[PDB]
Every structure is written in C-alpha cells, then in structure tokens.
Amino acid sequence: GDVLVTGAAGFIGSHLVTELRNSGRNVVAVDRRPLPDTGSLREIRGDLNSLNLVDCLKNISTVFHLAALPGVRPSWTQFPEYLRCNVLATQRLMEACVQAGVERVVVASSSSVYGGADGVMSEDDLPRPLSPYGVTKLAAERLALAFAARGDAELSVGALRFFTVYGPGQRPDMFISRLIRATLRGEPVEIYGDGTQLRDFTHVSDVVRALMLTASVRDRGSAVLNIGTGSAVSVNEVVSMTAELTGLRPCTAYGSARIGDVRSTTADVRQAQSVLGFTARTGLREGLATQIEWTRRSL
Amino acid sequence: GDVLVTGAAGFIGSHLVTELRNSGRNVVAVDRRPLPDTGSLREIRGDLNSLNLVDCLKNISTVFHLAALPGVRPSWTQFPEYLRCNVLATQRLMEACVQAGVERVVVASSSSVYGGADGVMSEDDLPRPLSPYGVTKLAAERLALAFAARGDAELSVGALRFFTVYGPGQRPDMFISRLIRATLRGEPVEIYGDGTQLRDFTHVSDVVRALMLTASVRDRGSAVLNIGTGSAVSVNEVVSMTAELTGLRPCTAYGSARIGDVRSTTADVRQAQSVLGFTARTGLREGLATQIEWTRRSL
Ligand SMILES: NC(=O)c1ccc[n+]([C@@H]2O[C@H](COP(=O)([O-])OP(=O)(O)OC[C@H]3O[C@@H](n4cnc5c(N)ncnc54)[C@H](O)[C@@H]3O)[C@@H](O)[C@H]2O)c1
Ligand SMILES: NC(=O)c1ccc[n+]([C@@H]2O[C@H](COP(=O)([O-])OP(=O)(O)OC[C@H]3O[C@@H](n4cnc5c(N)ncnc54)[C@H](O)[C@@H]3O)[C@@H](O)[C@H]2O)c1
Ligand SMILES: O=C(O)[C@H]1O[C@H](OP(=O)(O)OP(=O)(O)OC[C@H]2O[C@@H](n3ccc(=O)[nH]c3=O)[C@H](O)[C@@H]2O)[C@H](O)[C@@H](O)[C@@H]1O
Ligand SMILES: O=C(O)[C@H]1O[C@H](OP(=O)(O)OP(=O)(O)OC[C@H]2O[C@@H](n3ccc(=O)[nH]c3=O)[C@H](O)[C@@H]2O)[C@H](O)[C@@H](O)[C@@H]1O
C-alpha cells in the first residue's frame, strides 16, 4: 500500500519522504506548512485538526506520524497549542486510522518522556517527564497504543522515542543549528546553564533508517523503541568540536538554565537492535561535519 | 493554612469538604456546579479554565485537585473536553500553585492509568492506559509531578490513584449506582459484557481518610500511591450481593462489552500503608449496604 507521513514538511519528515520515495514507495505527505522544493508524491496541505483524515488515508497501509510542536522550552507557556497539536491531533489521526483500516502506525515519541535520569534510559523505565512537552509526547504515544489495543483495531503501533536529532536540515531552534550559525555567521547563541548538560545526539540519517525498518519489519504487534546512539556528549564539548572543525570561534554567551531541560539523556539502544536490526552508524564528529557542510552550502 | 478543593461539588469532593470542615479546616471549594445543600467554607463558583486561579489560591497551603471529567467510556467521543478539563485545567492549576506558593497539591489520579493488567497493579508498573480517559489522568498526574520537580517550586505532589470508588452519593453514571436504581426502582441497567470483569471497589469513606492523611503527613517530597482495597469483585457478584441484601431482583440486561473498559483492576495497597499509614477498612458487603440504605433515604 501507499504510505502517509504527517509533519512531512519538517526536519525529520522531509528526510523520511525523500527516502521513502527513493525506495519506490508512493507517499502522501500531510503538513500545514509547504513541503521544501521513483515513488510518487502527493502533497496534502492542511492541519490534522481540520482535514478529513479518513479521506487522506484512502489506500494508506502505513502512517508515519511526525507532526507535532517539538520544542521543549516553549511548552510551559504555549500549552493549549501543544495539547492541540501533540495530543488532540494524535487522537483524531488514530481514530481515522481505525476507520480507514490502516495496518501500521509509527509514532514519533521522544526521549523527553524519560525526564531527568542519570545514565542509560531504557524502555522499561517509568516515564517521568520534566516538561509539559514531554507530557504531551507521552500522552501521544500512550494514546496510540490504546488505539492499537482496541478489539476492533487491526493495527499495530511502533512508538519510536528519538534522542536529540541533528544533521542537514535540522530545525533552526535546536542547539546545533544555533551553534553553527554562531560559528559560521557569528550570530550569538546563549548556552542555557553551564554547558555540562549532555545529550545523546542522533544523526537524522540513522533516524530515517530506523523509520524505514519499522516500515518493513514483520508484524509482531506494537512496540516502544528508543532510537539513539547510546553515547552522550556535553554542550561544551559540542562547542569545542565545532570550533575545531571550522577554525572559527563560536559566538557564545552563558546564561541561566531553563526549567524543563533535563541534565542528561543517554539511550539504551538494545531493543531497537533486537527488534529492528537497527544500530546507529553516525557518530557526532562525523555528523557534525555533515551539518556544518550542509549549512555552508545553504548560506 | 487554608485548603482548596477543586471538583468540590462532585462525589468524592463533597465528602472531602465535609471531613475537612469537621476536622477544623477552613475550606475554599471550587467547582463549576453548585455545592450540595467547625471549619469555614467559601464556595467559589466557576470553571478552572476561566477563574483567576492565583486569586482563588490566596492563603491556600494545600490543594486537593479532584475536578475532572471522570467517565471512562465517553472519553473516546468527547476527547477535546476531556483534554480541556483533565489536562489543560491541571496545567493552569499547577502553574497557579507555583505562583501562589502553595505547599502541597494532592491530585486525584486513577487506576485506569494501569490499563489491562491481570492481578495486582503496583505503582512501579509501567502505565499502559486502554482508554483516552486513562491517558488524560496519566497526563494530569505526570504534569503535576513535572511542576513539583521545577527548581523554582517549593511544592510537593501526592498523586493518588484511586480504585473504583462507591458509597453514599456515588455519581449516577457508575455501575453500583445504576444497579441500585435497577433494584430499588426497577430501572434497567445494562451489563457491558458477560459480567465476569472485576473491580477493586473502594468505599468513599476510606478514600476521604487517605486524602486527609495526605493533608497531614510530614513532607517527604512527591509520591504516587494507589488508594484501593486489594480485593477485586466481579460485576456478576455485585449483582448477586445486591439481590441478596434487598430481596428484590435487579433489572439487568447483558449487552456488548465497551471498548476501553479494562477486564480487571486490583490495587497493590502496600505503598499507601507504608507512606500514609492507610489501609482501607470497608469491605464491599458492608459498603454496598451503606450505599443501598443512603439511596433509599435519598428517594
Ligand atoms: N528533532 C528531534 O530532536 C526530535 C527528537 C525526538 C522526537 N521528535 C519528534 O519527531 C517529530 C518530528 O520532529 P522535527 O524535529 O522534524 O519537528 P518539525 O517541527 O521540523 O516537524 C514537525 C512538522 O509538523 C507540522 N505540524 C505541526 N502541527 C501540525 C498540525 N496540527 N497539522 C499539520 N501539521 C502539523 C509542522 O508544520 C512541521 O513541519 C516530532 O513529533 C517531534 O516531537 C523530534
Ligand atoms: N469515582 C471514582 O471511582 C474515581 C476513581 C479514580 C479516580 N477518580 C478521580 O477522582 C476525581 C473525583 O471523581 P468523582 O467521581 O468525584 O467525579 P465527579 O464528576 O463527581 O466530580 C468532579 C467535579 O469536577 C467538576 N469539574 C469538572 N471539570 C471542571 C472544570 N473545568 N472546572 C471546575 N469544575 C470542574 C465537576 O463539576 C464535578 O463536580 C476525578 O479527578 C476523577 O477522575 C474517581
Ligand atoms: O530528545 C528529544 O526528545 C528532544 O530533543 C530536542 O530537545 P532538546 O534536548 O531541548 O534539544 P536542543 O534544543 O537541541 O537543546 C539541546 C541542549 O542545548 C541547550 N541549549 C539549547 C538551545 C540553545 O539556544 N542553547 C542551549 O544551551 C539545551 O539546554 C539542551 O541542554 C528536540 O528539540 C526535541 O524536539 C526532542 O523531542
Ligand atoms: O478506578 C478508576 O480509576 C475508575 O473507576 C470508575 O470507572 P469504571 O471502572 O468504568 O467504573 P463503573 O462505571 O462503575 O464500571 C464498573 C464496571 O461495571 C461495568 N458497567 C458499568 C456501567 C454500566 O451501566 N454497566 C456495566 O456493566 C463496566 O463495564 C465496568 O466493568 C470511575 O467511573 C472512574 O471515574 C475511575 O477513574
């Protein structure tokens, strides 16, 4: 069948559409923003909360649900919109998927469902989100699993908890994008806290490969899987690496930590290896170079 | 300080207000419905999503957050309102509690966050709700805990997962209330499925005692605690018990199971015993008699 991608104009979604089409799949792309300029492509422009979702899902066997408001920090002060985009739209989409007979829905969830854990975050750990954004992504994934559990549903859900994704095309509000502009263009970036916080930074090419594997693995019911590298790097170390790669001093200013940001993320990578055969291939130094090079050419 | 109860006009809230006042506490009651006809009582009428919550919280040290849309089954088809009442209102209340310097917030959560588990449901089990209602109660409790975790918050949260509460005043959409009307008044009740589903039915007097203990225990940070009996009884057994107690045949009709209802709940009761000194005192046969007697007098 054909594949539908929500959030297809965004950072991860646009890369996914490209790979799905390259692999021969007919893609239906849904987003309220325009798509950037072998399988066919139909662009459906509109809001998940306004579109006739059942109509959008005709002949669709697999849905990749990537649409969301994704920023951790604005979620404290924009909560109605985060609920509307991240939770209500998910419920409407899942109901439409039951009605349209979709077979598989892969939902983008987030490492922010774990909250503030030291060391390795495993899919059997209790979610303890520290931001309203993390709560909305937890609610979206739990809702998707509740729909898959209905006795009238013939669908399975793959809930993929991605870890801080970067690379060519990264959303411009994320740290690595801002730091690259602070280096190549001298546009200052604020470091929120002392920079010792850590992230498991995962390159978008590995995330898209994991998504493709969920489009293809044999059906074994629903699953919750971390998609990350298992290696965490500090903000200060990313700054140093960027200075080294470019021979330009990043324009940084240290400022106050932002409530809701967790101190460290690190994925347990074992379940995705077992279930999908997925292990991330790109480490940060290689990946950071890819993003710097893409950004240069983009400017 | 004074105590504020949201949802104070409802089933559990009205009993809580009575006990708080009887114990000498000044109570501020908030609900969008009118309250039923030693500590003082101020009735604040309005919607949590419209009121000036900081103003409502002046001089309030402890908040009991019981307002919600509580029905499991309508949540599939009323999801915007469940989000608005159960999640958005919770976020607004918690932000107001941080701004007003409230010290302790006790949040009514629900056994429906566990989903469909056999045997004993423990606070260390991963939540896997099977209804959109369960997702909204999970989101409300997780949000409350995220606010308590903020570095600027001087507040602790007690998230109490109640198990199927009954007794005098029970909401009329719940099974025991409907079954009592089907017995005392012959108004037929539909049994949803074959009646072999089980619940841990907890009497409201025990729930109010657990709530009072959370108003009083020494502060040891935030906690998630089941409030139940640890004994589950089937729907068919409740029917038989009601027939026995009354000498009237309940007017029942078996119908189709309702998607989203879990097959069994049973609380693990240990953590509330450890943390609060709470063990439920009322078993179902005694409690069912209390509710039947109250309903007779109420008719
Ligand atoms: N980027 C990361 O580091 C990361 C990590 C974990 C999870 N995620 C999750 O992955 C997904 C994709 O993230 P991204 O970085 O590509 O974000 P993005 O903002 O680039 O893409 C999301 C897209 O969703 C669209 N959208 C939002 N609300 C919509 C609505 N109501 N109707 C129609 N379209 C709507 C947006 O226009 C946007 O193009 C999100 O669900 C996000 O929560 C991202
Ligand atoms: N009754 C049970 O078996 C049970 C079990 C587990 C959890 N709970 C939870 O306990 C709490 C109380 O349950 P209950 O059975 O007493 O329900 P209830 O419906 O009797 O009381 C809830 C009250 O909240 C009010 N309310 C709802 N939305 C409001 C809003 N936006 N603003 C102001 N008031 C609002 C309602 O008018 C109502 O009086 C709920 O949070 C419920 O989810 C109940
Ligand atoms: O893993 C995840 O699930 C989340 O990863 C990222 O969230 P975040 O960790 O906030 O990513 P960045 O915005 O790139 O921030 C990374 C680190 O840099 C810090 N930061 C960010 C931005 C900035 O301008 N300055 C700065 O110091 C942040 O405090 C944080 O510690 C994505 O933005 C979320 O969409 C995603 O859900
Ligand atoms: O424990 C909880 O957290 C939940 O307990 C109850 O939810 P529920 O289990 O649905 O309670 P009832 O409505 O009293 O239903 C109990 C059983 O009776 C069945 N039932 C209910 C109503 C009815 O008319 N017929 C009927 O057979 C239900 O299928 C269910 O198995 C409360 O209604 C929720 O507010 C609460 O959050």
H/E segment holding residue B56 = helix B53-56
Q: In this structure, what token pair is assigned to residue A242?
A: 């960027």
Radius of gyration of chain B from Cα atoms?
19
Separation CA B183–CA B169 (nearest Å):
17
Give whole-number Cα distances, B171 to A297, B10, B46, B135, B271, in Å. Answer: 64, 8, 20, 21, 27
Cβ–Cβ < 8 Å for A165, A233:
no
Closest CA to B275 of B203, B206, B227, B208: B227
Closest CA to B174 of B202, B144, B209: B202
Residue A142, burial from CB neighbour count under 10 angstroms (0-12, 13-18, 19+): buried
Closest CA to B112 of B78, B161, B76: B161
Residues B56 and B115 in one domain: yes
Question: A175: annotated binding-site residue?
Answer: yes
Torsion angles phi and psi, residue B236, rounded to 5: -60, -40
Mutation probe of ligand 2 site: the residue of B49, B162, B163 with most atoms within 8 A of C-beta: B162
The structure tokens 């994991």 sit at A210
H/E segment holding residue A107 = strand A104-110
Torsion angles phi and psi, residue B185, rounded to 5: -120, 0
Name all contacts of B289-295 with Cβ < 8 Å and 24+ positions apart.
B289/B245, B290/B167, B290/B168, B290/B203, B291/B166, B291/B167, B291/B168, B291/B170, B291/B176, B291/B177, B291/B180, B292/B180, B292/B183, B292/B184, B292/B242, B292/B245, B292/B246, B294/B167, B294/B168, B294/B169, B295/B177, B295/B180, B295/B181, B295/B184
Residues B98 and B9 in one domain: yes
Residues A272 and A283 in one domain: yes
Closest CA to A274 of A205, A203, A220: A220
Give the best residue of B259, B263, B271 to mutate against chain A (max A CB count within 10 A): B259
Radius of gyration of chain A from Cα atoms?
19
Residue B132, burial from CB neighbour count under 10 angstroms (0-12, 13-18, 19+): buried
Residues B107 and B90 in one domain: yes
Cβ–Cβ < 8 Å for A152, B259:
yes
Torsion angles phi and psi, residue A99, rounded to 5: -65, -35
Calculate how far, in angstroms, residue B165's C-alpha sits from the geometric centre of ligand 4: 9
Q: Which residues contact A193 (CB under 8 A, 6 or more apart)?
A: A235, A254, A255, A256, A257, A258, A261
B296 touches chain A (CB under 8 A): no
Q: To what resolution in angstroms was this structure determined?
A: 1.5
Q: In this structure, what token pair is assigned to residue B53?
A: 């919550």
Separation CA B287–CA B293 (nearest Å):
10
Mutation probe of ligand 4 site: the residue of B128, B192, B198 with most atoms within 8 A of C-beta: B192
Strand partners, B27: B3, B41
- Residue nearest to ligand 2 atom 19, measured at CA: B10
Residues B118 and B143 in one domain: yes
Give whole-number Cα distances, A179 to A189, A228, A243, A259, in Å. Answer: 6, 21, 10, 21
- Residue nearest to ligand 3 atom 31, measured at CA: A197
Q: Which residues contact A209 (CB under 8 A, 6 or more apart)?
A: A19, A278, A281
Of B228, B243, B269, the residue at which a domain comes to its end is B228
CB atoms within 10 A of CB A172: 10
Q: Which amino acid is at B81?
A: E
Residues B73 and B207 in one domain: yes
Q: Would you state the torsion angle of the CA atoms of residues B200, B202, B206, B207, taken in this order, to the nearest 10 degrees? A: 100
Residues B4 and B137 in one domain: yes
Cβ–Cβ < 8 Å for A202, A227:
yes
Q: Would you state the torsion angle of the CA atoms of residues A112, A113, A116, A117, taken in this order, to the nearest 10 degrees? A: -110
Separation CA A18–CA A169 (nearest Å):
13
Of B181, B213, B228, the residue at which a domain comes to its end is B228
β-strand pairing of B2-6 with B27-31 = parallel
Distance from CA of A113 to the nearest CA of B (A): 10
Cβ–Cβ < 8 Å for B79, B132:
yes
Residues B235 and B285 in one domain: yes
Residues A222 and A85 in one domain: yes
Question: B172: annotated binding-site residue?
Answer: no
Cβ–Cβ < 8 Å for A106, B122:
no
Ligand 2 contact via B171 beta carbon (within 6 Å): yes
The structure tokens 């539908």 sit at A4
User: For residue A73, what is the DSSP state?
Assistant: G
Cβ–Cβ < 8 Å for A242, A186:
no
| CATH number, residue B247 | 3.90.25.10
Helix, strand or coil, per DSSP, at residue B159: strand
Q: Do A146 and B127 touch (CB under 8 A)?
A: no
Number of domains in chain B: 2
Calculate how far, in angstroms, residue A90's C-alpha sits from the geometric centre of ligand 3: 23
Q: List CB contacts (< 8 A) between A142 and chain B.
A: 127-129, 135, 138
| Total beta-carbon pairs less than 8 A apart between chain A and chain B | 80
Q: List CB contacts (< 8 A) between A138 and chain B.
A: 138-139, 142
Kindly identify the ligand whose nearest atom is closest to the C-alpha of B181: 4
H/E segment holding residue B134 = helix B132-149
Residues A148 and A8 in one domain: yes
Helix locations, A47-131, DSSP H = 53-56, 79-83, 89-100
β-strand pairing of A233-234 with A198-199 = antiparallel
User: For residue A190, what is the DSSP state?
Assistant: E
Comparing alpha-carbon positions, the chain A residue that sits nearest to B113 is A142
Longest dimension (CA), chain B: 59
H/E segment holding residue B292 = helix B284-298
Name all contacts of B81-84 with Cβ < 8 Å and 24+ positions apart.
B82/B132, B82/B133, B82/B136, B83/A83, B83/A87, B83/A88, B83/B136, B84/B49
Q: In this structure, what token pair is assigned to residue A241?
A: 């690496």
Closest CA to A173 of A274, A241, A78, A47: A78
Calculate how far, in angstroms, residue B100's C-alpha sits from the geometric centre of ligand 3: 29
Residues B162 and B276 in one domain: no
| Closest Cβ–Cβ partner in B95, B135, B142 for A143 | B135
Q: List CB contacts (< 8 A) between A152 and chain B.
A: 259
| CATH number, residue A117 | 3.40.50.720
H/E segment holding residue B271 = helix B270-276
Residue numbers after which chain B breaks, C to N beyond 2.5 angstroms: 37
Residue B9, CB-side half-sphere exposure with 13 Å CA sphere: 15
- Residue nearest to ligand 4 atom 27, measured at CA: B191
Residues A160 and A45 in one domain: yes
β-strand pairing of B198-199 with B233-234 = antiparallel
Q: Which residues contact B260 (CB under 8 A, 6 or more apart)?
A: A146, A150, B72, B73, B75, B76, B130, B131, B132, B133
Cβ–Cβ < 8 Å for B107, B141:
yes
Question: A263: annotated binding-site residue?
Answer: no
Separation CA B114–CA B136 (nearest Å):
12
Strand partners, B247: none
Known active-site residue A114? no
Residue numbers of the domain that contains B75:
1-166+200-228
H/E segment holding residue A291 = helix A284-298
Q: In this structure, what token pair is assigned to residue A70?
A: 């994704």
Catalytic-role residue among A82, A114, A133, A166: A133
Cβ–Cβ < 8 Å for A188, A253:
yes
B100 touches chain A (CB under 8 A): no
Residue A7, burial from CB neighbour count under 10 angstroms (0-12, 13-18, 19+): buried
* Ligand 2 closest atom vs CA B89: 31
Ligand 2 contact via B156 beta carbon (within 6 Å): no
Mutation probe of ligand 2 site: the residue of B4, B5, B11 with most atoms within 8 A of C-beta: B11
Separation CA B168–CA B298 (nearest Å):
9
Helix locations, A131-186, DSSP H = 132-149, 175-184
Separation CA B298–CA B281 (nearest Å):
25
Separation CA A189–CA A250 (nearest Å):
8
Sheet containing A223-227: which strands, arranged edge to edge? Answer: A41-45, A27-31, A2-6, A60-65, A104-110, A156-162, A223-227
Strand partners, B106: B64, B158
Distance from CA of B257 to the nearest CA of A (A): 10
Closest CA to A56 of A25, A96, A19: A96
Separation CA B29–CA B276 (nearest Å):
24
A 233-262: CB under 8 A from B: 257, 259-260
CB atoms within 10 A of CB A283: 13
Q: List CB contacts (< 8 A) between B135 and chain A.
A: 139, 142-143, 146
